[PDB]
Amino acid sequence: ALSVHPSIGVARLGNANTDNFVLNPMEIGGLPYEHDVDLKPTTTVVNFKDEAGCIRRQGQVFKVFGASNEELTLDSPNVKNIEWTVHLANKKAAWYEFRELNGNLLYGRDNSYSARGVPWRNASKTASSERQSLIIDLGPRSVSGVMATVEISINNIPETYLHPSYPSGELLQGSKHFESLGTLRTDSQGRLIVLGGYGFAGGNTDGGDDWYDDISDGSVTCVVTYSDDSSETSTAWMVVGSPDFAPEIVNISTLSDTCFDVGVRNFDLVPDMYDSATGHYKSDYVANFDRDILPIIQRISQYQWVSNVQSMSGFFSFQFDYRDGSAANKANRMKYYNYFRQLDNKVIGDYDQPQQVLMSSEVEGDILPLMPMNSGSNSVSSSNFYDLTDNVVEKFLALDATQLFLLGQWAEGEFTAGPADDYPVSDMDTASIGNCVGLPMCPGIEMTWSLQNPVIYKDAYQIKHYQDKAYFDVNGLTPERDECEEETGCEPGDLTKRMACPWQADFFNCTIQTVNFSEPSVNKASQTETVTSRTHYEWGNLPAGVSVPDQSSVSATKNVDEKVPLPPAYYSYWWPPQSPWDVLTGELDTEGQLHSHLPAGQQINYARGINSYSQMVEHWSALAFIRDRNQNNDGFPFFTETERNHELFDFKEVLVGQVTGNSEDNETSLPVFFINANKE
Amino acid sequence: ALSVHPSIGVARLGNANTDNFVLNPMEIGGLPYEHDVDLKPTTTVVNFKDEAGCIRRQGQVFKVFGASNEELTLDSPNVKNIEWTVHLANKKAAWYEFRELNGNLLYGRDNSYSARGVPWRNASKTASSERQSLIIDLGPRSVSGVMATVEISINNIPETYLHPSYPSGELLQGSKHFESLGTLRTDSQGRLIVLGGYGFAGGNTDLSGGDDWYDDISDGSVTCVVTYSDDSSETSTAWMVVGSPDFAPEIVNISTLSDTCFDVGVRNFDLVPDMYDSATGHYKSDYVANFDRDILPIIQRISQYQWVSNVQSMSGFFSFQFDYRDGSAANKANRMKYYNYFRQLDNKVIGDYDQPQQVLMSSEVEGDILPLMPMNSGSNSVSSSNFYDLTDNVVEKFLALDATQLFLLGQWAEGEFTAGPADDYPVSDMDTASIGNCVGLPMCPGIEMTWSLQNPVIYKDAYQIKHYQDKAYFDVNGLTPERDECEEETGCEPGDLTKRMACPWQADFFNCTIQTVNFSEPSVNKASQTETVTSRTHYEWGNLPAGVSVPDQSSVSATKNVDEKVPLPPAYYSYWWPPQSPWDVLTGELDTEGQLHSHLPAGQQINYARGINSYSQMVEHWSALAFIRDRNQNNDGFPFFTETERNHELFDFKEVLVGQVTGNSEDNETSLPVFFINANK
Ligand SMILES: *[NH2+]CCCC[C@H](N)C(=O)O
Ligand SMILES: N[C@@H](CCCC[NH3+])C(=O)O
Incomplete structure (x- = not known):
């Protein structure tokens, strides 16, 4: 059978000229690549922007491999064609309003969008056909051959695609005219390059309804036709994100870590690490320092270039030897491990849990922020918001369950020094999504917590597809369908629809959160500040025999704010690698x-x-x-x-x-x- | 036959307690009156506000007189009863947007609201029944007898009044709950007192927009039925108008609404046959004015503006630098120079811009520069000829007197005037005392009322508003939201005299301040102004050691500011209504x-x-x-x-x-x- 890599492609928006782009990073934390006239990668990026100060698009190269893992191109013997069909859509305007963890079925059916009462975006549109038209969907495009180019344009929608949709005409605020979701190319040997949007973000209000962006995601199909006209077909997915403004700085938990964790716990990806029959990790699994632990320490060590998280410095100081697995060093490893937050359970209404704890202690002498020190996936809304009494709260960050398991094995002395065998995951699969945020997700940057749900995958790292080209040709996309609820796969637009519409709102607010740390069920509360002032006047330096009466009056002010962080609160970052905050001038x-x-x-x-x-x-x-x-x-x-x-x-x-x-x-x-x- | 006075009553809004009011002024520039427990006036007002700082309503007393001009009350020998019926309404939300002089038919049919394409307020409502429901109309109320009180409330609409309307429910901005247009009372002898609104202004859109807004200004008909001992009866009518507070009641407008009614009367209803020839349509140049009656008040009114505005250029018009009562030849050149500094009136012809009211100064030659008189905005110093999709929008930049006042001033200048007492005009004092405390000019739109009052077709005679239809007609039909009394000519409905004003009136008050008025292009009031600032920044460094130098640095930056509608320079700082909306005042x-x-x-x-x-x-x-x-x-x-x-x-x-x-x-x-x-x- 064939395979396409990466399994989940990642492109990034850019407003430079359509023909002026870089190619994908080739590793986690890698720079994107300049390319030659054949569209093959050459050197790492020289400038991210063009001379006019416009950001260059980043494109994703996809490659297809035969049964014995050899790459197939137009130059391979017995290959007469390779045809890529990509269907990108933006379902954001058709989806629910983002309400932190509401709608996330990992917390149970009682946390469904319907059970939580979450409103639809553009709520005055209630008929299915009206909802469908809110979707940006230009249909599929196909590309094959040597150096091909075709736009995903409102001007070349195939005749067979019966239900295209998009914000048409002149928009009243922001970008005026929507035109494209991106560009498909092939290189000189028939490999696919997908380029995404141009940074379009416009709408017809000042407020927020009837807004759009050109983020998108969707299916990749590859058909390889052999010389005798037989063919094989294989699939992948594609996601477009806003620019990576610090590509060399890696998220402590990346989306590759997310896919990996989902894989281990749900798809038997690493049988030695986790017992799928019982639902527990195996305590005899021996971790590897360089493969499993070192990356966490390295990632922690680079946040200082984009945020002030000096309390994390002790976790990469090598104040003791992290490579020493002996009993003599165990108390040290365990102390390091025990400063990490354990994961909350995913039970509704359970607040007094490790992710609601900020510090190791509040006794002076024993005070340290627990690790990693960052917001969790809900530091925004309290238990009692949205007319609920049991809204899910997750104040502070934890590692993912698999990272944390492996860290525990290190702490126990169950790890090696030296080379490990790689996990059964392609490096091309980690290199794309390993550059996307994995946690926290409120909603996140590229993608949100649907990616944690094993029901969207057909196997580790592989998105399950719902339906096929011929279905969508006739029917279009399904605006109300939740892939996490139906379990039968994803449609174009499903991986990005939950994010802010437009994305620049995620970007404006992906900064810091001031997070209460005294009441586990509370993030925000009303605050009333009453200031009562008595002014008293007296006059002096008067002549002998003269006096004037004092005067006084009272005044008061009352300020009420409905939803402010409850004190005492801690200054907590959101996504420093993806949305920098404190940086050096250069x-x-x-x-x-x-x-x-x-x-x-x-x-x-x-x-x-x-x-x-x-x-x-x-x-x-x-x-x-x-x-x-x-x-x-x-x-x-x-x-x-x-x-x-x-x-x-x-x-x-x-x-x-x-x-x-x-x-x-x-x-x-x-x-x-x-x-x-x-x-001017 | 009976007559009711005033012909056009005036009450003023107030948010104090419903039972805490003053009564009407008794003369032009008169204070309002405290009253006794019989609701008879006593001494002039003590405090305008109650102890909590809420403004007291001002109420209007109406009286009815017999064929002998003797007052009739419940105490009169042959009087069994006096029954008053007042129908007030607010049509503001159902009328057109105010667009200065657009819609004013004194400029011809080509200036009609339809020909000018003026939009309706709350334009999404287009069926007649939905327009009608924008009206605040609670039907008529009646009062009779000794010391009666009846509210004009949403809770006592007569069952016979089939189509009441008002803004129901809780409004989203400003005042929350509409309940009343005012109160009718009678005094101890059965005279009518009408009190108006409480200052309600609220709506459902944010003014920071402005559709679905309402205030409790109103106006409408007054009917008096007097029943005699034998059970026979006679009936007579008047009108009633509610305005926002008079914040400077002792200061009189140079042209009041009494002057307006008078002018309209002279020119259109033969009110003073010796002054004006109604067969040829000209004033009579042999009419002899009277200094104290005709001229002195103009001079006196000019002299008070200084308390509420800076109009020092008007000081020469009340200085008595020469003797204003000397009608001799030797003093004629002085009286003529005074008169010649007054603006003549523009002709109300569309497309004619180069006219006297577009002229600011006597001249712009140094030594000969004075602002022409009166120095104030006219009735359109806001919109240019090319606004509102038009090419010949009517402009009137600067103030003039009315035609009658100006005629009489010219008679003075010519020496055709007397010193001493004059014949009174055939107008009741009781009719001048009400509306003589309202703004007459300019009207853009004005304060209490606007330029419909200048149109003779709304009157049945001088100072008397013509009534359209009758009580039964409105009981069944309600009011007619789209009907222009000035177009139909068959009379006014309740709400017609106030509907053109800003909705809410606090917009007229906020903006009744000053205007910066262009005086270089007669067709232009405002223009777009684009200001481009191009800046070269240059840096040099010095005091460096011997042999050291560094290159200069420079760069260029620009800003381009565009304001779409601002006064075109050169412009002149001009007042709107200093007496009615003060601007420069003394702390007290x-x-x-x-x-x-x-x-x-x-x-x-x-x-x-x-x-x-x-x-x-x-x-x-x-x-x-x-x-x-x-x-x-x-x-x-x-x-x-x-x-x-x-x-x-x-x-x-x-x-x-x-x-x-x-x-x-x-x-x-x-x-x-x-x-x-x-x-x-
Ligand atoms: N993923 C980041 C969301 C930011 C939330 C925001 N500061 C809030 O308090 O609403
Ligand atoms: N200053 C206002 C008009 C004043 C209204 C007064 N009657 C404008 O330029 O629109």
Whole structure:
């Protein structure tokens, strides 16, 4: 039988010229690739943006392999053609509003979208045909041969695709005109390259209904026709994400770790590690330091370039020897392990659980944030939101169950030093989704927690397809269908539909969360602040014999905020590798320093100047790519901002006395970055 | 035959207790009246507001007189009963959007609402029954007898009134629940008192938009039926109008609505045959005016504006720099120079822009520059000729007197006038006293009423509104939402005199301030203005060691600001209605407590609306504003008007040092006061 890799492709949006793109990373944490005129990868990316400051699309190369794992191309003996059919769709406008973990069936049927009352997006549209038309679906496109190109355009929808849909005409805010979901190409030997959207994000309100973006996902079909006209067919999936603004920095739990974990616990991917008959990991499984543990430590060690998480420093200091498996070092390994949060169970209404605990202790001397130190998958809504009393809460991050099992085996001394055998997972499969966020997912960046649900897969790393080209040709896509509920596979648009519509809202808010740590069932509460003030006046320096009566009055103010983080609260990151927050300035020449208004080497806010959600929707592409300036020298990283469109931004230095009224404060100033709409 | 006075009553909104009211002024520029328990007027008003800072309603007393001009009351010998029926309504939500002079048929049929394509308010409602239901109409109420009271309430609509309408349920913004248009009472002798609304303004859309908004302004018909001992009866009619508060009742408008009715009367109903020839349509140049009756009030009114606006260029028109009562030849050149500084009236012809009311100054030659008179906005200083998809939108930039006032001023100038008492005009004092306290000009749209009042077709005679149909017709049909009384010419319905005004009226009040008026292009009031600033930044570094140099750096940046409709320069700062919506007024608190709360010393001129920083705040907090009043009223001829009764406690205050704005701490020797409303109080 044939196989296509990667099993889940990953492309990234870009607004540069349609013909100006990079190719996929070839490993987790790898840079994307420049290419030659044959569309073969050459060197790692030189610049992420074009000269005009537009972000280049990143495309995914897919390859097809025969029974003995040899690659099939148009040059293979006995191959006369290879035809790729890709069907991408965006179902976001047709899906439910995002309400954290509501709708996630891993918590049981009582957490279904219907049982939780989650409203549909664009809720005034209630007939099925009206819901279907909210989907962006241009039908499938096909590509085959040497150096082919075809757009997934509203202008070349096949005649056989009876139900296309898209936001038509001139949109009233953001991007005006939707045109394309991306481009399919082949290289010089017939391999597929899928390129995604252009960063379109527009709608007809200011508010939020009737909005769209050009994120998409869907099916990949490959038909290889042999010289005698027989054929074989094999499938994969494809996902488009917004730009990876720090591609060398890897998420502690990636989506590859997610697929792997789902695989181990549900598809017998690693029989030695987990006993599928009983539903437990095997305590005799021996982990491997370099394969299983080291990546966690390395990933933790790079968050400092995009966030302030210094409390994690002890987990990569090598204050003791992480490679020493002896009894003498066991107390040390166990102490390291015991600082990681165990996983919550997935039971509705159970709040007092390890992911609601912030610190090791609150006794002075014994205070450390537990690990990894980041938000969990619901630090936003309390138990009592949305007219529920048992809304699922998950305040703080944990590793996935498989990572954590393997870490425990390390802690126990059940691990080796030296080479391990690879798991039965292709490296091409890990290289795509290993660059996507795995946790937390609220909703996340590329994908959300449907990817944790084994019912969407036909085997580890492989998305199950619902139906086929001939079905969708006649019927179109099914707007209300939940692949997690039906269990019979995914439709185009299913992997990305749950994310924010438009994505730049995920991006604007993927920063930090201020998370309560005193009441397990509470994230936010109403806060009433009453300030009662008595003003008393007296007059003096009066002549002898003169007096004037004092005067006094009382005033009060009452401020009510319906939903604010309950104190005491902890400053917690969301997705530092995918949405940086605290970064170093990198302009080393006078011109870049004048334009950026900053010296090099200073830590500042990554998004400075993008002061509103509407600005992010329009100017996302102006932001920097965080990159290792010392990449040639392994082990001595120096990550700074590169390629920020500094000219977009204006700048004012406000003296502190401007705010306070005290001119002595003007010895200190506050830098303010912003975007003036009136600039040319 | 009976007659009812006033012909057109005027009441004013108030949010104090329903039982806490003052009665109508008795003369033009008169204070309203306190009253006794019989509801008879006593002495002029003490406080305009109650102790809680809520404005007291002003009610209108109506009286009915017999064929001898003798007043009839329940105490009159041959009188068995007097029964009053008042039908007030608010048609504002069912009328057209206000678009300055569009719809005004005095400019010809080509200026009709339909020819001009003016849209309806709440334009999504198009069936006649749905338009009708936008009207606030609770039917008529009747009152008779000694000390009666009946509310114009949603809870006492007569069963015979088949189509009442009003905004039901809870409104989403501003006032939540509509309940009443006002109160009818009788006094101890059976006279009518009409009190109007309570200041309700609410709607279902956000004004920060403005569809499905309502206020409790109203107007409508008054019917009096007098029944005699023998059970015979006679009937007579009047009209009634409710306006927002008069915040400076002692200060009179240069042209009042009494002047409007008078002018309309002279020109169209033969009210004064010796002044105007109705067969040829011209004034009579041999009419001899009277200084005290005709001229002096203009001069006096001009002289009061200084208490509420900065109009110092008008000072020469009341200085007595020469003798205004000298009608001799030797003084004619002076009287003529005075008259010639007044704007003549524009002709109401579409497309004719180069006319006297587009002219600001006597000239722009140094030494010969004076703003023409009266110096104020006209009835369209807002929209240009090319607005609203039109090419010949009617413009009228600057104020003129009315045609009658100006005729009489010219008779003065020519020396055709008397000193001494005059013949009164055949107009009751009781008719001038009501509407003489309303704005007559300009009307864009105005305050109480707008330019329909200038149209003779709504009148059956001078000062008398013509009634369309009758009580039975409205019992069955309700009111006619689309009907223009000015187009049909067969009379007014309840709601017709106020429906054109802003909905809610607090928009008219928020904007009745000043206008920056272009005076270079007669067809233009506003234009788009594009300001492009192109900036080259250049850097050089110096004081470097010997042999060291670094290159200069430079770059270029630009901003392009586009405002779509702003006054076209050069422009002139022009008032709207200083008497009715004050702008520059004197602070009035003479004791320490009032000064601490106000944050100001007494005697300082400051902005009247300070702290009301948005339209939405005006809609909520109109009633906090001051009444401008003569603190020296006991001493005739020595006025001293200041704010009184401002609800200072509503407002917060910040003193901003100028260096907070500029970045230069040396500028901190100077500060700017900023008043505002913190909703979290
Ligand atoms: N995946 C990130 C969502 C951010 C949530 C936001 N700060 C909130 O409190 O609503
Ligand atoms: N200032 C307003 C009009 C004033 C309305 C007064 N009667 C404008 O430019 O629209």
